[PDB]
Amino acid sequence: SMKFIKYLSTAHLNYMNIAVYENGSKIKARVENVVNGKSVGARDFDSTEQLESWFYGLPGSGLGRIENAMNEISRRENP
Amino acid sequence: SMKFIKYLSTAHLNYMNIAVYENGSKIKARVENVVNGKSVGARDFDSTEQLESWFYGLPGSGLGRIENAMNEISRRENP
Amino acid sequence: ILSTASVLAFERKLDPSDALMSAGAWAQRDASQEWPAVTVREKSVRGTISNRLKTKDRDPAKLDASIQSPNLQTVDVANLPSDADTLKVRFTLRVLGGAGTPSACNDAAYRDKLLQTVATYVNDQGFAELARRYAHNLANARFLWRNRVGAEAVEVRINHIRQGEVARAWRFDALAIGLRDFKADAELDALAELIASGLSGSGHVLLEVVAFARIGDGQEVFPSQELILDKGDKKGQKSKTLYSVRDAAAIHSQKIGNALRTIDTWYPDEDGLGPIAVEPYGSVTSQGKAYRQPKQKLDFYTLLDNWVLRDEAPAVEQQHYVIANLIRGGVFGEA
Amino acid sequence: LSTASVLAFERKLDPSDALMSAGAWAQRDASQEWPAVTVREKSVRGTISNRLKTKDRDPAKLDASIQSPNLQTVDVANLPSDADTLKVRFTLRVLGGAGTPSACNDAAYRDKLLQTVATYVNDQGFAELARRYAHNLANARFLWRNRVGAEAVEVRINHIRQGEVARAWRFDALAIGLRDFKADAELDALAELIASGLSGSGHVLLEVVAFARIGDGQEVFPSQELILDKGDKKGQKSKTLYSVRDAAAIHSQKIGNALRTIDTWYPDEDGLGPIAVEPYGSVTSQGKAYRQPKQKLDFYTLLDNWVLRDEAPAVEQQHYVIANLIRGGVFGE
């Protein structure tokens, strides 16, 4: 049960974007290929306010900022 | 009574290869030094068909695959 | 007795080089020595998600959001300059010779049995049909893959180069010479005899092939495309990449080598596709179809294993096919 | 007398790595400045070509294999599109003292080996072996596949006495054969230089330069590297060519193998030709080891007969044993 909310950008980059799912009281951000749904990395979040404070805290402006977001999520999170 | 069949590769790696012996109705795979016959680890098998389905199921291609095979056999099998 | 050799290998004959593209104007191709190279640029594209969408189990809001949003890629493009309509493509070809002899073989009885079989094939007839069909693939412009599609005129110049000086020059028309029928000509027979004497081992054959394909001003040309594994975390935005050399767009050598050996007109399925390329299990990847299937008995491995081992010859055209797979080269035997 | 438990021989005729570079024919006289051939990188989409197991000879499995990708990345080395020849240079030291082992246990086996090699040298010099090594320098055996299908090949050999060259040679690698061994004036002069070098009576330093007129943009063949295609990220390049800084190179041992292709008395036949000098003399590229130890022509058999029991073999097998000692190796148990 992961209800879709919105894509994180206005434009897709290379058929790649960040989808936003509501996973219970948490909230999900998956790096997905838009034509077939293959995820290449996700990260857990809880509130949309802190998610936007994290996203707008990234360096960049627009598609460069979501490039930074997909490079951040698309690496393996360290133990 | 362990009749030799074939080596598992075309080339030796570091004077090391995998020899194949027919041990009764079973079949043996020994990690042997080719110049003196010192085994450093063996593993029991029964059929050549399942042995090839195990070997071709290993990750790699060629000498990297038999490197994976010798690293798999050359460790002590867990109880 | 006389089982197959567990290691067979044939190095290839008919060695091409990479073909460098350059652009210029027609009726100045008689002085086309100094034409500037076609450069690979890099532009940005914005499109739509217009692929077959999996509308079997999906949220409709996600499907509506995915197709109402644009896609912002970056591609490599190769155009002509705007004051030039003719594309030049230049590559060299060496025809080695000594086709029957393998470069790796376990058995010594299978090896000289194979050598006697290929000596019988060279004895009862030359390489005349095979070299005739390779000279047809040089005479038209198969190596201009999409650059031939929709052109006013294509002209192919072929030079025989013995020393620094050119020894023998041909000049053709790739649109008059067909794409499907293997007709006859005097200079096609001369070029075929030169290629056949190269394959037999008489002289040293070096060929320069220059193709002029008039397209139009500023149109897109099509170099061969590259592979961008393990760069999605560095670049990410760039999706298409063209093969180049030190500042010139170029086609790969193996693709021209595939274009030269599209000869096989004897595959049993049909004749409506024309010739296909000489392959073991002779197949086309665009068709997605394994023509020359191994459950019928026209497979290359089956014809080899009964024309060498069991001493039973196939028909003459299947013999031409087997010697074409030996001229092609490849890693035979069991891998 | 029993042979020692540890034997060793350092190699003589040790070459350096070749350095390939490309330029123009009839400009090879001024060739100290040619740009080196670089190892570039291209992409290959393969096909289904190996033998099927005949349990997978179905229509749908072949169609799925043809729709499956087989994308790879390989290294290639080509000439520039205006260059038509290949310059290859390397240097070669000729040591001498080719009977003394560099490690031995038995002081009696050592002295017996010394006077056995000494009575070989007193019976006949290094003249036949140096004749055959001068032949493998004369033709272009170290151009392995680069020679195969070349317009004209030419080999320049200089003797380096000081900073200045002392003696020069100019050869024709195609007229000088690949199948037999002949005589010529400059060949015998080079053979006598190598024979003076192998007997410890001088210091010989040779640089050898070879030119092979191939064609514009053709594929040269540097030596290929061993890479283990294991399960890393997404698959790497599947063909690595050996190189140095900004230059494609042939290994030193490949040239050293192409120099010692001498042996014509392995007991199979004379129909094939000369093979490389080797204990259990094996052409591994055709999967067959000639000179099996089941006959009486193995190197260890000839050594243990002709040093311990003092029975001499034929003169041709004496040439074989002394070429094995010039090769070097790990001998003994």
Side-chain angles (χ1 to χ4, degrees), chain A, chain B, chain C residues 1-55 60-268 272-335, chain D residues 1-55 59-267 271-333:
Chain A
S1 179
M2 293 175 70
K3 293 179 179 179
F4 182 76
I5 299 168
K6 69 180 180 67
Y7 286 102
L8 196 62
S9 179
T10 303
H12 309 290
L13 186 60
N14 198 0
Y15 298 98
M16 299 296 290
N17 203 357
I18 295 171
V20 176
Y21 293 100
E22 184 69 27
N23 194 1
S25 294
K26 290 184 179 180
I27 185 167
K28 184 65 69 68
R30 291 176 65 184
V31 180
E32 291 181 351
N33 189 357
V34 299
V35 294
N36 53 6
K38 292 181 181 180
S39 176
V40 294
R43 187 177 179 181
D44 292 332
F45 292 96
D46 53 354
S47 178
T48 183
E49 289 86 2
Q50 63 90 30
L51 189 274
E52 295 298 327
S53 74
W54 176 70
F55 180 73
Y56 288 112
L58 289 170
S61 297
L63 287 182
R65 184 171 65 193
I66 199 163
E67 172 68 28
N68 289 315
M70 290 186 286
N71 288 318
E72 195 274 335
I73 300 170
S74 66
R75 68 175 184 265
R76 290 177 181 173
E77 184 177 1
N78 297 114
Chain B
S1 178
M2 293 175 70
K3 293 179 179 179
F4 182 76
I5 299 168
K6 69 180 180 67
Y7 286 102
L8 196 62
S9 179
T10 304
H12 310 290
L13 186 60
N14 198 0
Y15 298 98
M16 299 296 289
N17 203 357
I18 295 171
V20 176
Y21 293 100
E22 184 69 27
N23 194 1
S25 294
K26 290 184 179 180
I27 185 167
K28 184 65 69 68
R30 291 176 65 184
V31 180
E32 291 181 351
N33 189 357
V34 299
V35 294
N36 53 6
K38 292 181 181 180
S39 176
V40 294
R43 187 177 179 181
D44 292 331
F45 292 96
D46 53 354
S47 178
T48 183
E49 289 86 2
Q50 63 90 30
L51 189 274
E52 295 298 327
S53 74
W54 176 70
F55 180 73
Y56 288 112
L58 289 170
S61 297
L63 287 182
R65 184 171 65 193
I66 199 163
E67 172 68 28
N68 289 316
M70 290 186 286
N71 288 318
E72 195 274 335
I73 300 170
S74 66
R75 68 175 184 265
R76 290 177 181 173
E77 184 177 1
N78 297 115
Chain C
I1 58 171
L2 192 63
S3 296
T4 67
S6 65
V7 173
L8 282 172
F10 291 88
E11 68 181 1
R12 66 179 183 271
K13 276 74 187 169
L14 299 169
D15 282 328
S17 65
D18 294 329
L20 308 183
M21 290 193 285
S22 69
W26 191 265
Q28 292 180 357
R29 64 261 176 90
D30 289 333
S32 67
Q33 186 62 258
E34 68 274 11
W35 283 0
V38 172
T39 58
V40 174
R41 289 183 288 113
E42 183 174 359
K43 68 181 182 180
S44 299
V45 297
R46 174 176 172 179
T48 56
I49 305 299
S50 68
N51 297 112
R52 187 178 294 271
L53 189 62
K54 193 260 185 181
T55 65
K62 186 177 179 182
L63 300 178
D64 287 334
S66 66
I67 66 170
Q68 291 174 357
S69 297
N71 195 5
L72 265 298
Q73 300 177 358
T74 300
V75 298
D76 284 331
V77 68
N79 291 109
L80 286 86
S82 64
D83 55 352
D85 55 351
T86 304
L87 177 64
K88 182 182 178 181
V89 167
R90 183 184 181 275
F91 68 99
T92 60
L93 181 65
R94 293 189 296 122
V95 187
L96 291 178
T101 302
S103 67
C105 189
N106 297 124
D107 196 3
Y110 187 80
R111 183 180 183 273
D112 59 0
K113 184 65 181 293
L114 180 63
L115 290 175
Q116 291 180 359
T117 302
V118 179
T120 306
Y121 180 80
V122 175
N123 195 4
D124 58 352
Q125 55 188 353
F127 290 99
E129 184 70 27
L130 293 175
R132 187 177 298 168
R133 290 169 181 261
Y134 288 122
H136 279 85
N137 281 323
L138 279 171
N140 59 11
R142 297 292 184 101
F143 55 90
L144 297 177
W145 287 89
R146 196 176 177 182
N147 302 318
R148 186 178 176 177
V149 176
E152 299 188 1
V154 182
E155 184 180 2
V156 180
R157 292 181 180 178
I158 303 165
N159 293 320
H160 179 66
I161 293 173
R162 184 177 293 166
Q163 296 295 321
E165 186 181 359
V166 177
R168 177 68 172 86
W170 291 275
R171 187 171 294 174
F172 280 153
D173 190 4
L175 298 180
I177 297 167
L179 190 70
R180 289 180 179 176
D181 290 329
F182 291 97
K183 293 179 181 179
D185 194 0
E187 290 181 352
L188 277 171
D189 287 334
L191 182 63
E193 284 173 348
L194 184 67
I195 294 170
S197 68
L199 287 173
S200 66
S202 296
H204 191 270
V205 173
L206 180 68
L207 299 174
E208 181 181 0
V209 180
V210 177
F212 299 107
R214 171 185 270 172
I215 299 172
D217 290 335
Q219 295 295 322
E220 183 176 0
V221 299
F222 298 98
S224 61
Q225 186 174 358
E226 286 286 318
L227 177 61
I228 309 301
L229 58 88
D230 292 330
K231 288 181 181 178
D233 290 329
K234 274 79 70 178
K235 182 64 67 68
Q237 60 174 355
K238 185 171 73 175
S239 66
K240 184 180 178 181
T241 304
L242 304 176
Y243 175 69
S244 66
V245 297
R246 296 177 290 171
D247 291 333
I251 310 171
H252 291 104
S253 66
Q254 70 271 19
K255 195 174 183 182
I256 300 168
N258 195 1
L260 290 178
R261 58 179 169 89
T262 309
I263 283 175
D264 195 0
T265 59
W266 302 287
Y267 60 96
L273 276 74
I276 64 170
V278 174
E279 292 287 328
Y281 312 100
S283 67
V284 183
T285 57
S286 68
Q287 298 294 108
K289 178 68 179 294
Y291 294 97
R292 192 178 287 270
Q293 196 69 246
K295 63 177 62 56
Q296 287 83 20
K297 301 286 103 176
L298 294 183
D299 188 13
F300 166 69
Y301 288 148
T302 301
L303 293 176
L304 187 69
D305 288 331
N306 64 3
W307 182 41
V308 174
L309 301 179
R310 295 176 180 89
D311 294 332
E312 55 182 1
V316 181
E317 66 272 18
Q318 305 299 318
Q319 294 175 358
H320 293 295
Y321 169 71
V322 172
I323 302 300
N325 270 318
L326 294 178
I327 293 168
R328 176 188 178 272
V331 180
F332 295 150
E334 184 64 35
Chain D
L1 181 62
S2 177
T3 183
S5 65
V6 169
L7 288 174
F9 289 91
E10 289 178 354
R11 64 182 179 272
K12 277 75 184 172
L13 275 297
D14 47 351
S16 67
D17 288 331
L19 275 305
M20 291 191 291
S21 63
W25 191 263
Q27 198 179 5
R28 58 184 174 89
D29 294 330
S31 63
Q32 285 76 241
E33 71 274 13
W34 282 357
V37 169
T38 59
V39 176
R40 64 189 182 184
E41 187 180 4
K42 74 178 186 181
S43 295
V44 172
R45 188 176 68 85
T47 180
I48 303 299
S49 65
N50 52 1
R51 288 180 182 268
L52 293 176
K53 297 297 290 183
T54 323
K55 296 179 182 179
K61 293 185 184 294
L62 277 179
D63 297 335
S65 69
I66 293 163
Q67 295 181 359
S68 69
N70 197 0
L71 271 299
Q72 292 179 356
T73 306
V74 295
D75 282 333
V76 290
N78 294 108
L79 287 87
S81 179
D82 51 351
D84 59 348
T85 187
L86 181 67
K87 182 180 177 181
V88 170
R89 70 179 294 273
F90 67 101
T91 65
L92 184 63
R93 290 187 290 119
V94 178
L95 294 179
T100 298
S102 67
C104 185
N105 296 121
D106 293 336
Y109 182 80
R110 185 178 176 91
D111 202 359
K112 186 69 181 293
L113 186 63
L114 260 72
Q115 71 244 11
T116 300
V117 179
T119 188
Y120 176 77
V121 172
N122 196 5
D123 194 1
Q124 59 187 359
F126 293 101
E128 183 70 29
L129 293 174
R131 186 179 298 172
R132 292 185 177 183
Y133 290 119
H135 278 87
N136 286 323
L137 285 173
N139 60 12
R141 290 284 181 87
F142 56 90
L143 299 179
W144 283 83
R145 194 177 174 182
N146 295 313
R147 181 177 175 174
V148 178
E151 283 285 330
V153 185
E154 191 271 328
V155 176
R156 292 182 179 179
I157 298 167
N158 296 115
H159 179 72
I160 299 171
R161 182 75 270 172
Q162 292 180 359
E164 189 180 1
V165 175
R167 184 68 173 89
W169 289 274
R170 182 174 291 173
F171 284 150
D172 192 5
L174 296 180
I176 298 168
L178 190 144
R179 295 180 181 272
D180 288 329
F181 297 99
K182 281 84 174 180
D184 198 2
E186 300 294 325
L187 295 182
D188 289 330
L190 182 63
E192 185 62 31
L193 185 66
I194 298 167
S196 68
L198 284 174
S199 69
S201 298
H203 184 273
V204 177
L205 180 61
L206 299 172
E207 64 174 357
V208 180
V209 179
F211 299 101
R213 193 176 71 239
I214 298 172
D216 291 330
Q218 292 297 321
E219 182 175 359
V220 296
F221 297 96
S223 64
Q224 181 177 0
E225 283 288 321
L226 176 63
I227 51 172
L228 277 78
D229 197 1
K230 290 173 70 175
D232 58 352
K233 297 293 184 181
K234 300 291 185 181
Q236 73 275 18
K237 57 196 291 186
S238 68
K239 179 183 176 183
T240 302
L241 297 175
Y242 177 73
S243 67
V244 295
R245 291 186 297 273
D246 202 0
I250 304 169
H251 289 104
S252 67
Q253 70 269 20
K254 194 169 181 178
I255 301 165
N257 195 1
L259 288 179
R260 58 183 169 89
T261 308
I262 285 173
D263 194 4
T264 59
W265 296 286
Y266 59 98
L272 191 145
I275 71 166
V277 178
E278 182 73 25
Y280 311 94
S282 62
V283 182
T284 313
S285 297
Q286 276 70 242
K288 179 66 177 177
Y290 298 102
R291 194 179 291 273
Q292 202 71 257
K294 276 77 180 175
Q295 293 90 21
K296 197 176 174 66
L297 289 179
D298 192 9
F299 164 69
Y300 291 146
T301 299
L302 298 177
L303 185 67
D304 292 332
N305 291 324
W306 180 50
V307 178
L308 296 179
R309 293 177 181 88
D310 201 0
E311 56 182 2
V315 178
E316 56 199 8
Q317 303 301 321
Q318 297 180 0
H319 296 296
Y320 174 69
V321 173
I322 299 300
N324 283 311
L325 295 178
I326 290 171
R327 176 182 179 270
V330 179
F331 299 153
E333 65 93 19

